[PDB]
Design a protein around this nucleic acid. Structure first.
Ligand SMILES: Nc1ncnc2c1ncn2[C@@H]1O[C@H](COP(=O)(O)OP(=O)(O)O)[C@@H](O)[C@H]1O
Ligand SMILES: Nc1ncnc2c1ncn2[C@@H]1O[C@H](COP(=O)(O)OP(=O)(O)O)[C@@H](O)[C@H]1O
Ligand code: BEF
Ligand code: BEF
Ligand SMILES: [Mg+2]
Ligand SMILES: [Mg+2]
Ligand SMILES: [Zn+2]
Ligand SMILES: [Zn+2]
Ligand SMILES: [Zn+2]
Lengths: 343, 370, 334, 249, 364, 176
DNA sequence: TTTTTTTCAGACACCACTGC
RNA sequence: AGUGGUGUCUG
């Protein structure tokens, strides 16, 4: 199939419409805008009737097959849509997706929306049979190092003037929150029809919504950015994240750091990285962290992490978020006191 | 002796006017002023510890609202409405045992019938008791009718922990916090009750009962009933001291002194004497620990001592002035460790005995001879 | 369910109690794992539920005993932790208690057997009260436990306790030699690692855990001279972590014993490693390491869902920290 | 399978007889009560009479029917599930019903098939003491006439605890109901009676079930005072009695 | 002729009436005066340790409350109500296993039926046992009905852990604290039981059982039944001492002496000998604690050594002359911590060995 | 807004009482309005500063922060008064110790990095800053250790009240 | 490239499908 | 209303 970013989708849609469109990724906003563009282009070429379905173990597949095979009294040119579940094309769903891949026709246009597909796990069969004459659209959230240029492009295409300061403020409050970021730009356009956004204008009309995953917290710890890591920790506290997930995500990299710092006396860090199968972008930040106050924080932090783990897993009142703040501050070149470490 | 007087002080002495409450004055004053001025808020919450007049004051307010006369802060008794409320089974005072109506379907059933006019009184006073038991959906269901209910419906909430309520509701309803009761109020209430029950009582008995009630008057009334049952319908120092399982402060202070003044033989003698009286050994340790803490508090400030133990006040002062704080801390820590290790001691008697012997051996100003 | 010889006398002392009708309904067995408490309870149940018992054994002919052999008996209730969970919930206890209200299906007694009372939840143990206290007529209860003091006080209050004594050390060594053929000191150390219980030592020999013990011994032969205790993680982190932590603590105890010139140590077949432990490590450090290893083993065993890797990593790093001079050592407390 | 070679009691009973016997007592059982001996129906055998007794501590129902065959006095408690499913399978009154009760299990041969159940270990209470021993007030009415009046009163009844106050005056009966909404229902009925004015507040569902169990035309109620129980039965027989213990509200 | 069979010493010998209760004279006289004077509460909470009588006292109170004679301090038998109550048949006594009916649906449908009149008795007694296992919402459901129950309802709560109850639940009850039974009175009850049951015995086994029951009579009866099974129906000193681990010899003094001199090889050799003897490690440690306690006693006041141990008297006096009190206190604390942490050790012998390793190397 | 509402309601109000009510509102205007109606209740149609402050103190539950402020300042009478307040409110004592522990831990984390103050504690920001900037980390370490030890030994005390009082007495006696 | 969580017990809340 | 499932939140 044609693998495509949202940038050229319009162009591809102007070239022609394929049998099936697969909108995949973890970003609600990018998927939604891609689906809207696809539906508008389809309606331009006569696809008037729409449908929606949620791919679920309790869905009625017979209705989908009936509407795909049969035609309607009006608006014969029809389109169909399916929301894939959180996990993806379950093993009980691949066969019926294959049937749909057989039950299609040039009259119908299929839209597939859901999270990213683990291609290493799921491939061929359904995937290749669509790949015959289909389009894959990858709509994933831009990361922190990439978000500012995305926001600049969005401001340019919405006819706004964003300076670097407003851009970084917007990139600060809204991460993993591209939907609310676009809504914030829309609200700022509504607030001032001038279209010129400065620092105070965006600063006043913005909330610290954000959305982080424990990987962001662990990366912030490895870079040793105190404010960034603490902001991430507060955000996962407010979001309601399970602290034990944070514990495991930090523990994996912390034990890797302990192993690397212990073995670095006999082997350069490059061969250790190769031994443990760690990737290059990970390699850079882990090399930055390994020579940043090591051999003391790597056992003191393991001690504090064990304290948090046992306290979390014995009682039911939790109250481990402050201890996680202690960890966030220990691994960022801000030494703590033995009083809180030992307990 | 007497007839079937089973009606216990706990319930027979439930206050029936705002003049019969033992002094939740921050609540009573506000209710009286609002009811006089007519600023009758549509929903509010009596929150406090156990047995300090939340339910009782709620009933008194229902009486004040539903009296036949004009809306008054002092309910009457000749009125039919207040008579029904006092006797229970009133048409409009709908007591809601919230711990039995936690579900949201029960709350919805409650909210459907809200708009119906009151039958005989002027308010359909919903009295939701133990509100903290309502589920989250029940609370959110109550939210809208708590914002503005019909002009005749009043919500009277009552709970022990106001922090388990969602804070939206804490916004919707007024908050009155009923604090615990000082020893003097509890003892005066017990005095009055036993005067009206024709039961001879002694001073020290009532002082000990009020001390062991722990700031709540329902515990005091249950303890008074238990003491009356322990005696022959009479309240006395012996009966209350045997019931509470404590010691007169003189014996405990004598043992504490024998520990401090290195009179180990006196320690042994008083231990044997307390063994004769059949008093729990952990009780002995707890009483010595309490006296040591009181000495430390006196060392902080003279106003630490309460009037309840005034009999030993002088000695307290002396032992506070004789012993510098480090020795008091050492004794308190030694006795605390002894009490903590008492369950694993071979015998409780010899556990306390070895705790005392350790407090005597590690004595800084007069250690046991080596 | 294999019959061990040392159950043969004790069985009598119990079965005779159930022959005259004088038997306490709730019999709590205190026995080390592998000592044979399960086989004893099973044999007692077969004796009790047989419609026509002969002497002191199961007849092997009646409907009750043939149903027990078939694994299906409505009057035979068992309380075992759910597969994949090391816990006996309150639901199973409550279900069995409600089923006890009905009469016995086969007209005989009702026998309830709890596989291990130590795994009982607090709620499950409490739900078993007032049913151990006053069970319906012709109801016989049974329980097993490694250490009775770990149970609820009220739970063992209403139970007649029978203690299965581990056999004499010479006889246990003889039984192990009859079962498997290895060096005498190997069997001796395996026995006294297992608190004198030949069943646990035999299970240790049959499984691969003895090879893992040897792996820990080699990793210690490297770790002690160089102060490199972190390496032991590869030899410690496993599903069987408590056993290896117990072995480590027992090695440390043997080193401390040799420091005081104790006549007999536990790891009798590993003299070189215990000699290295004694020579290199100061007795105060040895005591601190032993205490922390035992505490970590207890934490790993008790709190459920704990991460073995974090616990063992912290333990090893703390030991390495303790070896350095100028640091304080832990003080046991109340 | 059948190891219960010996049986305590045996019946060759018509299906309709036991159908009435259970139907006249089933509604008074206890469902998942803490008193495990009350979560069932007591079959009691004395002389040529078999009785079903069911109570939950708030209402008692006893129904007796002759058999003709002399049987030893015996008592048994059949649990709720067993008796309910036996009632369900008790159809086709043409075929007789065999009953075989042992000391631990019960068997019912219905038509050609066999049903098996276990017993409740507890001992059922004595229902003779629950029955009032000195009924001084006796009143009579029509079964349908009384029942329809109770239903009309129950229309405006407390939905939580369906309770009515029954007043008895000279040749007059009064049924008053109210709900938390003060909606009052009042029904007055003409009865034959001789005694003193008395009020008694009791549940409505229990009385309505009692009346539905007695598919008769004349009903006699026996009452002692405002606090004790009420014994309801039909005036055409004494084989079925019911005890409604009132509310103190 | 037992009802079906001999139903254990503990179940048969429950107090059938008043004046059969062992000890507990506080609650016994308080309940008697409440019954006689008309001062009857609706909620009695019998809280105390195991096997000192909390269900038995509550059942006796239920018998007395609704006996056919009247509201009597001493219930009879013979008549219907108190005959049914002891047989587990009486309808008006509702016995709740709060450890099994922890759910709130159960508490709520229990409170549903409270309004109905009692079947035959005066009071519809609700005896909730093991109350502390009720869920939080269950306690809060019971709140407003324990506060104001109908005139015919009595609540009898029984708890081993009164602290676990909400303060509100404790506030609405008479919290009768069931004191444990001291050695003499539990011994007297055991003597009376064994005499009435015609079982020969010896006094020394009696006080061994009395002092090893930890002040609980149910444990005394359990140990008595265990000794009966062990001793073939005779409660003898030898059978109890073999069953219940006791240190008849002076090895508890020998090991203490070797541990005082900080002698390691001797201490370990004696521990190994004790293990060969099949000693009870808990018993060994409690004997050590008592021995150090008496050492401290004779250090404070001479001639305080009990005449019982006059045989070894001089030795301890020698220790009183030699070892300063601080070291004896340290040894006592170490052995007590070993007692506390003995269950939580990989082995009992290993726990004792760790304790004596901590206790052996203070000074050198 | 409270000022305007009271001025248009012809309700006599003191300027400081309005600020007290607003601070007690925690940012919600309806909380301020309900507290205002209650303050008029506690009195006779007038919002007096003394009555409003007394009502707020009656409703106050911020005991642990005040206890830490007074204990660090070494104000024994204020500490004992605050313990009396926490007793009269029927406040759990172990919960009080846990709250004080959390406050001290947060103060230390703020001292390490200003970003440790999240948006969960916007009501008590300033005080926290005041305590973090002015108190050396050694004293915070000592107080945290003292309160941890006290909470460890709280169950074995004459009662929870005396245990908490003695732990705070030790913390005061440190005077570091 | 992916990489992310212990637990036993209990309390609600909503939504089939049944059964009248 | 009975039964079974999903899911979320409290210790
Ligand atoms: N302020 C008070 N004045 C007099 N008696 C009181 C007071 N507070 C509690 N009591 C006693 O406690 C009993 C029950 O009080 P209650 O008002 O139910 O407390 P709660 O707030 O916990 O429901 C009353 O009958 C009364 O004897
Ligand atoms: N006070 C007592 N007087 C006489 N026997 C007692 C007493 N306390 C306990 N027992 C004995 O203990 C057995 C169990 O008593 P029980 O009342 O069930 O204790 P619990 O409070 O722990 O439920 C009784 O059968 C009786 O033999
Ligand atoms: F309503 Be209170 F807590 F007894
Ligand atoms: F009910 Be007891 F505490 F065994
Ligand atoms: Mg109340
Ligand atoms: Mg009991
Ligand atoms: Zn009035
Ligand atoms: Zn057989
Ligand atoms: Zn009688």
């Amino acid at each position: 199939m044609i693998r495509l970013y949202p940038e050229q989708l319009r162009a591809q849609l102007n070239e022609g419409l394929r049998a099936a469109y697969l909108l995949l990724g973890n970003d609600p906003l990018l998927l939604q805008e891609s689906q809207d563009a696809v539906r508008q282009v389809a309606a331009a070429q006569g696809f008037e009737e729409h449908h929606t379905f949620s791919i679920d173990p309790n869905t009625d597949w017979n209705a989908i097959f009936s509407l795909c095979q049969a035609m309607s009294l009006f608006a014969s040119r029809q389109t169909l849509l399916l929301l894939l579940p959180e996990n993806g094309p379950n093993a009980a769903i691949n066969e019926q997706l294959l049937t749909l891949t057989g039950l299609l026709h040039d009259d119908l246009l299929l839209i597939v929306r859901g999270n990213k597909l683990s291609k290493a796990q799921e491939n061929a069969a359904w995937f290749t049979a669509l790949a015959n004459r289909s389009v894959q659209v990858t709509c994933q959230t831009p990361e922190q190092a990439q978000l500012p240029r995305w926001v600049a492009a969005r401001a340019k295409q919405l006819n706004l003037e964003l300076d670097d300061a407003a851009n970084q403020v917007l990139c600060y409050c809204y991460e993993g929150n591209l939907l609310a970021l676009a809504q914030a730009l829309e609200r700022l356009s509504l607030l001032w029809p001038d279209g010129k956004l400065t620092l105070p204008r965006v600063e006043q009309a913005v909330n610290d919504a954000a959305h982080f995953t424990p990987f962001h917290w662990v990366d912030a710890l490895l870079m040793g950015k105190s404010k960034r890591a603490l902001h991430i920790l507060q955000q996962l506290r407010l979001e309601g994240s399970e602290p034990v997930i944070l514990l495991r995500t930090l523990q994996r990299e912390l034990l890797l750091l302990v192993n690397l710092k212990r073995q670095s006396a006999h082997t350069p860090l490059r061969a250790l990285f190769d031994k443990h199968r760690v990737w290059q972008n990970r390699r850079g930040m882990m090399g930055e962290a390994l020579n940043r106050l090591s051999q003391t924080q790597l056992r003191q932090a393991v001690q504090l992490l064990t304290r948090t783990e046992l306290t979390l897993k014995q009682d039911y009142g939790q109250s481990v978020w402050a201890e996680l703040e202690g960890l966030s501050l220990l691994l960022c070149h801000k030494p703590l006191a033995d009083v809180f470490i030992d307990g | 002796g007497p007839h079937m007087s089973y009606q216990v002080l706990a319930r027979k002495w439930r206050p029936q006017t705002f003049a019969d409450v033992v002094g939740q004055e921050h609540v009573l004053t506000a209710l009286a002023n609002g009811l006089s001025l007519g600023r009758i808020h549509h929903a509010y919450l009596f929150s406090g510890t156990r047995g300090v007049g939340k339910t009782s004051i709620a009933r008194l307010l229902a009486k004040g609202l539903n009296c036949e006369t004009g809306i008054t802060a002092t309910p009457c008794g000749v009125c039919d409405n207040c008579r029904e409320i006092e006797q229970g089974r009133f048409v409009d005072l709908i007591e809601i045992d919230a711990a039995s109506r936690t579900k949201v379907e029960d709350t919805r059933d409650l909210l459907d019938n809200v708009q119906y006019a009151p039958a005989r009184g002027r308010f359909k006073v919903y009295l939701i008791d133990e509100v903290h038991m309502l589920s989250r959906h029940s609370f959110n269901a109550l939210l809208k009718t708590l914002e503005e209910p019909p002009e005749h419906v009043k919500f009277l909430l009552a709970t022990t922990d106001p922090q388990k309520l969602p804070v939206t509701i804490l916004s919707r309803c007024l908050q009155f916090h009923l604090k615990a009761l000082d020893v003097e109020q509890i003892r005066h209430q017990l005095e009055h009750i036993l005067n009206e029950e024709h039961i001879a009582h002694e001073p020290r008995a009532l002082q000990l009962l009020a001390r062991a009630a722990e700031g709540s008057l329902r515990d005091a009334l249950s303890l008074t009933d238990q003491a009356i049952a322990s005696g022959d319908g009479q309240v006395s120092t012996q009966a209350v001291s045997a019931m509470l399982g404590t010691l007169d402060d003189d014996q405990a202070l004598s043992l504490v002194e024998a520990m401090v003044e290195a009179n180990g033989e006196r320690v042994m003698a008083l231990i044997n004497e307390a063994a004769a009286r059949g008093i729990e050994w952990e009780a002995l340790l707890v009483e010595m620990l309490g006296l040591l803490h009181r000495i430390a508090m006196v060392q902080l400030s003279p106003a630490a001592l309460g009037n309840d133990m005034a009999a030993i006040e002088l000695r307290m002062r002396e032992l506070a002035r004789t012993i510098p704080p480090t020795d008091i801390q050492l004794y308190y820590q030694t006795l605390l460790i002894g009490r903590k290790e008492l369950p694993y001691a071979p015998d409780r008697r010899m556990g306390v005995e070895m705790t005392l012997l350790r407090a005597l051996a590690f004595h800084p100003r007069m250690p046991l001879p080596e | 369910m294999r019959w061990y010889p040392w159950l043969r006398p004790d069985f009598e002392k119990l079965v005779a109690s159930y022959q005259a009708g004088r038997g306490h309904h709730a019999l709590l067995i205190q026995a080390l794992p592998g000592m044979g408490d399960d086989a004893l309870i099973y044999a007692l149940s077969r004796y009790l539920l047989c419609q026509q018992p002969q002497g002191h054994k199961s007849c092997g002919h009646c409907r009750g005993c043939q149903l027990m052999q078939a694994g299906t008996h409505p009057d035979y209730y068992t309380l075992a932790p759910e597969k994949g969970k090391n816990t006996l919930g309150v639901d199973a206890v409550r279900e069995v208690t409600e089923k006890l209200n009905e009469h016995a299906r086969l007209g005989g007694a009702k026998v309830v057997w709890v596989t291990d009372a130590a795994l009982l939840t607090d709620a499950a143990a409490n739900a078993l009260l007032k049913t151990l206290e006053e069970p319906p007529a012709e109801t016989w209860f049974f329980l097993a436990t490694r250490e009775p003091e770990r149970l609820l006080a009220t739970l063992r209050s209403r139970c007649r306790l029978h203690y299965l004594a581990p056999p004499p050390e010479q006889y246990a060594v003889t039984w192990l030699s009859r079962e498997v053929t290895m060096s005498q000191d190997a069997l001796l150390a395996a026995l006294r690692l297992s608190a004198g219980s030949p069943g646990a030592a035999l299970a240790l020999f049959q499984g691969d855990n003895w090879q893992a013990r040897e792996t820990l011994c080699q990793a210690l032969a490297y770790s002690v001279p160089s102060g490199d205790w972190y390496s032991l993680l590869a030899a410690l982190n496993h599903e069987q972590a408590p056993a290896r932590l117990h072995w480590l603590a027992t090695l440390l105890m043997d080193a401390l014993k040799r420091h005081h010139g104790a006549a007999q140590v536990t790891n009798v077949d590993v003299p070189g490693l215990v000699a290295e432990l004694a020579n290199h490590l100061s007795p105060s450090r040895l005591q601190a390491i032993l205490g922390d290893v035992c505490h970590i083993r207890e934490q790993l065993m008790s709190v459920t869902g704990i991460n073995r890797e974090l616990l063992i990593t912290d333990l090893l790093l703390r030991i390495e920290h303790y070896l350095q001079p100028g640091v304080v050592l832990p003080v046991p407390h109340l | 399978n059948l190891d219960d070679w010996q049986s305590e009691v045996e019946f060759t009973l018509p299906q309709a007889t036991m159908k009435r016997l259970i139907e006249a007592t089933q509604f008074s059982m206890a469902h998942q009560d803490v008193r495990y001996y009350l979560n069932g129906m007591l079959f009691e055998t004395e002389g040529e009479e078999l009785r079903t007794v069911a109570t939950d501590g708030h209402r008692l129902a006893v129904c007796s029917m002759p058999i003709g065959q002399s049987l030893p006095s015996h008592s048994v408690i059949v649990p709720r599930k067993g008796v309910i499913e036996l009632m369900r399978m008790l159809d086709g009154g043409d075929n007789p019903l065999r009953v075989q009760i042992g000391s631990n299990n019960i068997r019912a041969h219905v038509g050609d098939f066999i049903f098996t159940s276990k017993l409740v270990d507890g001992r059922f209470p004595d229902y003779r003491r629950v029955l009032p021993k000195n009924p001084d007030k006796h009143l009579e009415a029509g079964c349908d006439l009384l029942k329809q009046a109770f239903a009309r009163a129950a229309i405006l009844s407390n939905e939580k605890f369906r309770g009515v106050r029954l007043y008895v005056s000279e040749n007059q009966l009064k049924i008053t109901a109210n709900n938390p909404e003060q909606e009052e229902a009042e029904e007055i009925l003409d009865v034959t009676y001789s005694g003193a004015e008395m009020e008694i507040g009791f549940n409505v569902s229990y009385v309505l079930d009692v009346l539905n169990a007695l598919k008769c035309e004349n009903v006699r109620m026996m009452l002692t005072d405002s606090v004790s129980s009420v014994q309801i039965e039909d005036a055409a027989s004494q084989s079925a009695a019911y005890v409604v213990m009132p509310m103190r509200l």
